[PDB]
Design a protein around this ligand. Sequence first.
Ligand SMILES: O=C(O)[C@@H]1[C@@H]2CC[C@@H](C2)[C@H]1c1nc2ccccc2s1
Length: 133
Amino acid sequence: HMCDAFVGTWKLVSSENFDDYMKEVGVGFATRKVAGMAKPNMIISVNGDVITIKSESTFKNTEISFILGQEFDEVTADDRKVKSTITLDGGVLVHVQKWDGKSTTIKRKREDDKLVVECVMKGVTSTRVYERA
Ligand SMILES: O=C(O)[C@@H]1[C@@H]2CC[C@@H](C2)[C@H]1c1nc2ccccc2s1
């Protein structure tokens, strides 16, 4: 029952500062413009200890499966090859990605009927809000 409140099908309803977050990550102009239009559906499921997060959009379809605390390789939507570790910290899913000596952290939390995602790269934060689909 670890992540029960995350499980489901979620649709992006708002975004703030995502272009600036992507710039800070190192994403180039064309990917920023096209990726920034996307309205992904995020599908979260749990089977035993394995959590799966799928993201489906017009730009890319991705999928990650993982066990909490156990590092895995991820190819991101913007084509970074990263080493990821996802943990639960006080009810927040905390996802750290490492690549090329860099690091970014993505936090996912339940707030009211929403799933709120905070993406941080150095001093730049983007907030992405999802509703049930
Ligand atoms: O999952 C998402 O919400 C988005 C949208 C759906 C697919 C693309 C656009 C994905 C990105 N994530 C990142 C992370 C860092 C840098 C660039 C990008 S594009």
